[model samples]
Target: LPSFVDWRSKGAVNSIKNQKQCGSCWAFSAVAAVESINKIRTGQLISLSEQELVDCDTASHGCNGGWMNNAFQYIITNGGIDTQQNYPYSAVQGSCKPYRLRVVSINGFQRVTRNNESALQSAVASQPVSVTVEAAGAPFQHYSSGIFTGPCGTAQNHGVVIVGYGTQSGKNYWIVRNSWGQNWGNQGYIWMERNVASSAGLCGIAQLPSYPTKA
Candidate 1:
């Protein structure tokens, strides 16, 4: 579909998160996608735990960055994950303190077509998708408002989620929900340039968009 889609408008997305001095954006990304999918499936929008993934997911290193795929896999292997109130987030890598209350669970996760905005759009239309981007640039670091047409690269340094997409003044953009705190950008979100010239799209956001499957 060519029409604009925004998951935030549908109340599927949770509040903006703060990774706070940690390289645990991957955990935030995965948890947000899972939280959205769980909300859609179970009719509940309870916040899940990023600290559980950060502290327990051994496939991914704590406070040193990680991958969304491995985070989801950790949930699958660990039976299920706890809630934010149960496990909580601590920025730094605290010891694994897995709570017994399995707040949510996903059957599996899937990555959308690599470097394809068309495919990424379709996946995003269906749900909030977890993705990575080159957020290592000053422009990205200081991004405030407007569609972020990056003066950035495709190194794919940070993990975030594509919460929605739409066009503004004839410019297409993806509503990227970030984990840098509510005071970071447009209230902890960025309208990233979409359908760009490169196959990887702006900031390599189209490189590896992914989402979780509801159990």
Candidate 2:
């Protein structure tokens, strides 16, 4: 896994987020991408707003389901985004506050090679990546720790972040950040199996992988 990488330990990751009972994983994932890239470029770790997206970005559902790529387009067109402090999360949908303050703005985003482990690894090694996973079954909801070797399937319903990749006890895995709250897994993270022979890898994580670049 290229020696090893941990964006959280390197201060590139923001605090863990709780999507609550809402289906806003897409917003959280997009927010994570902006947060990491902003910190990497500006050397400042600031929490961007997910609620802003939940309320403002019409292309995606507020508390329903959404896509990370649509969220990225909203961000690029909306000029930028505000901090969590200015446009804090409500866990539910609400009116969008005016675009008065912006902490960081992204010009565009790029998709990692679909179902390609090497491309996903390279994107994550440089910056945090936005990913979707099959998180519907008990195996996912009750995920506590360890390299998740599932009972999982290839259903890309929930969105998350791939902060880095590494090996645990000689098992290759991707370090993931989830929006399901810290009580779920390894402090709101999961170690998914990487480099599988299958194209989708674990839970179809590689099926729709993407990342944001600084403007």
Candidate 3:
């Protein structure tokens, strides 16, 4: 892990979010990135609109499934995103309220290398990162706490964030923030296995890591 680094302690991460049954984990992942980077840049923890991406980003499948990178591009092209107060998440597909106040702007995004845990760690140490994980099996669905020692496969069905990393009793792990609400896992957080050799790592978390840049 890297001795230690917690974006949550640094005040860069926001509260956990709930994706509900909408299958909008991609939007939650992108929103978490935006919220963290915006906080890191301006010292403002503003929750951006997942619903905006869920309803408006035509390039990505809104509720069914989507890519975090595509959501970043959508915000860049659409000028910016509105605050949660203005464009709140409905947990379902809704009409695009483009007239809602736009509060944060992202110029672009940078992707972590496809299987490089070192690169992923470095990126997350600086800011919370958007990532995808294999969440099909019981291990993921019923994850309560402790380092998730899989039953998870490399399916990459859900999106979440890496807010930091640490080691507990010699076991290294990545501190993850999930979108399934505070009712799941360690208050909606996970400690995924870290420092593994595979490029994709456990649960394919290293497959699609990315973050947005402030405009």
Candidate 4:
């Protein structure tokens, strides 16, 4: 199961940057988390583009609320996620590529309950899983006082990556990677209260290597 880390303010060089009022925090976190995991799993880092997911994946509203499972569904059934080099983010909404004979939409998706932290820990311990979270009023390379209602306290809003879990300074923390660039908190990452970090099923876990039909 995931462990807890002692609460500590973000360090000077350990935080990530923000996307400047873009709701695509979910997309960024998903892409960043998966990209990190894929690299860790394969020993090769491939910069999958959040822009592409936002652009092509119609179900998910760019910069808006989205589900992690939905993204994985799009990838497995569809050909696969595209690299940033293939398609880049405009940082603005745009039309999507219409479905074609060669390119097809995902069959569908299944929702995994985010209620189990121990299960989450087991999953992450076994392999990389992408998750979404709440990061209200997180500083812009700076901390704001009570920026957005206590981090939502479990409400879904922000998105992040679970690289691993451990105890530091006698505190348990979830080693998370963020998509806010590498200038916001903990160098694009944050050590969160793991148990509470994924409470009320807000922090969802999803994995993909094949479509549902195959496996």
In model 3, the runs with Cα more than 4 Å from the true position are none
TM-score per candidate, chains pooled: 0.97, 0.96, 0.96, 0.68
The 10-residue segment of model 3 with minimum total lDDT is: 94-103
Clashing pairs in 3: 115-199
Candidate 3 CA-lDDT value: 0.88
lDDT of 1: 0.90
TM-score of 1: 0.97
Model 4, runs deviating above 4 Å:
1-21, 97-113, 137-152, 196-215
Q: How many residue pairs collide in each prediction?
A: 0, 0, 1, 22
Q: Comparing 2 and 4 by lDDT, which wins?
A: 2
Judging by lDDT against the true structure, name the best candidate. Answer: 1
Rank the models by lDDT, top first.
Answer: 1, 2, 3, 4
RMSD of each: 1.1, 1.2, 1.3, 7.1
Q: lDDT tens digits, residues 1-215, model 2? A: 46688999989998788989888899999999989998898899999899989999999999988999999999999888898888888889998886558668997999999999888998888999998889998988888889998778888888999999998788999999998778989899999889988889888889998888895
Clashing pairs in 1: none
Task: Give the Å shift of residue 4 in candidate 3.
Answer: 0.5
